[PDB]
Amino acid sequence: PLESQYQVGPLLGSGGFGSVYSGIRVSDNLPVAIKHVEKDRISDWGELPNGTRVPMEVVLLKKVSSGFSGVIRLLDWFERPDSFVLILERPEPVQDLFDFITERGALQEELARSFFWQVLEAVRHCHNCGVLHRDIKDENILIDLNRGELKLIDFGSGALLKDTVYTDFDGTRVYSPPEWIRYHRYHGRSAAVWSLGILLYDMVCGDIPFEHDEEIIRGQVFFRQRVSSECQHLIRWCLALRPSDRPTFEEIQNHPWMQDVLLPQETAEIHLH
Ligand SMILES: O=C(Nc1c[nH]c2ncc(-c3ccccc3F)cc12)c1cnn2ccc(NC[C@H]3CCNC[C@@H]3F)nc12
């Protein structure tokens, strides 16, 4: 460990959140991403089964990294004097959803349907594993361009899923629900559905629906691109002001706009290749 086990490549991206390098596992040489995070920058911590002090991100990643390909899996991790190092899967070739939408503009609804469906399946997986992502957005989704498969990343703002109120939030504000803006309170699943509404709008419109707090609070959705009545309805449902008025995940996936989704590979062949 650890420079011995991997050859570090170019820096891929950086924030106060962390620094992520492209890497190869020597002995594979499996493509990986190497994420470094300073201990001083870590807000919430968790406990490992073996009884260890560890960043919450690691706890959450472990609970979700069991082979379902909808989430980027944690392959290994290391503690260093002033930081933790995470070894993550790296698809190749890859592009995040933010850059993809930026290049292509608003997505055709057939493509948005396929992508949105996969994100839903990924989020359902997380919730099933007792994990709430809390920062669902285009920048946090990778596209395996060859397979047409979407992968969730960055559990740095996440939490253990619970049925009681959350009173903290460190995800992206423009994706945060009106109940957070107004009361500093939200529940996990209904807040997630709100962010999914924002994500879906962004996909079919090429930009997010709200920029300011008062716009989020007002909750009026204006469409800047041509979008079918069905898709508009689903979006509006997801962005209901009252959390209890939002659809469940079952209701979203049973929505008429969500029917007859393409398989990931079909999606790649038609829209990606
Ligand atoms: O798991 C994470 N990243 C990754 C795991 N596996 C990957 N493979 C390819 C890439 C990748 C992204 C963008 C361009 C080329 C790439 F090979 C990122 C990751 C991750 C978790 N938290 N986090 C926080 C920041 C960050 N930075 C990468 C960003 C670069 C700008 N686009 C959004 C990405 F998240 N990455 C992460």
| CATH number of the structural domain spanning residue 184 | 1.10.510.10
Which DSSP state fits 3? T
140 and 201 fall within a common domain: yes
Q: Which of 60, 92, 124 finishes a domain?
A: 92
Q: Give dist(CA 116, CA 177) in Å, integer.
A: 19
**234 and 160 share a domain?**
yes
- Pairwise CA distance, residues 142 & 147, whole Å: 12
| Pair (128, 63) in one structural domain | no
d(CA 220, CA 241): 9
Q: Is 96 in the pocket of ligand 1 (CB under 6 A)?
A: yes
Please tell me whether residues 34 and 113 are part of one structural domain.
Answer: no
Please report, for residues 20, 23, 25, 54, the alpha-carbon distance to residue 28 in angstroms, rounded to integers and kept in the order given. Answer: 20, 11, 5, 27
**Domain end residue (candidates: 65, 92, 119):** 92
Closest by CA to 247, choosing from 72, 116, 111, 71, is 116
Could you tell which of 30, 139, 142 is best to mutate to test the pocket of ligand 1, judged by most ligand atoms within 8 Å of the CB? 142
- Mutate which of 6, 8, 11, 12 for ligand 1 pocket (most atoms within 8 A of beta carbon): 12
Together in a domain, 27 and 127: no
128: Cβ contacts below 8 Å, ≥ 6 apart: none
Which CATH number goes with the domain that contains 9? 3.30.200.20
Distance 35 CA to ligand 1 centre (A): 9
Q: What is the DSSP letter of 106?
A: S
Does the annotation list 170 as a binding residue?
Answer: no
Residue 135 falls in the annotated catalytic set? yes
Residues 29 and 144 in one domain: no
The boundaries of the domain holding residue 2 are 1-92
The CA 218 to ligand 1 mean position distance, Å, reads: 33
User: For residue 42, which of 10, 96, 86 has the smallest C-alpha distance?
Assistant: 86
**Shared-domain flag, residues 137 and 260:** yes
User: Using CA atoms, how far apart are residues 113 and 258, in angstroms rounded to an integer?
Assistant: 6
* Resolution of the entry in angstroms: 2.1
- Identify how the structure was determined: X-ray
168 shares a domain with 127: yes
Residue 109 in marked binding region:
no
For 164, residues 6+ apart whose C-beta sits below 8 A from its C-beta are: 187
Does the beta carbon of 36 lie inside 6 Å of ligand 1?
A: no
Are 126 and 200 part of one and the same domain? yes
Alpha helices by DSSP H, listed for 83-208, are: 97-104, 109-128, 178-183, 188-205
Domain count, the chain: 2
Domain-ending residue, one of 41, 76, 92: 92
Does ligand 1 come within 6 angstroms of the Cβ of 64?
Answer: no
Contact by Cβ (8 Å): 140, 153: yes
One domain for residues 131 and 255: yes
Q: Are residues 82 and 176 in the same domain?
A: no
Contacts of 183 (CB under 8 A, 6+ apart): none
27 is in an annotated binding site: no
Q: Are residues 78 and 54 in the same domain?
A: yes
Q: Is 16 annotated as a binding residue?
A: yes
CB contact burial 108-136 (16+ within 10 A = b; e otherwise) = ebebbbbbbbbbbbbbbbbbebebbbbbb
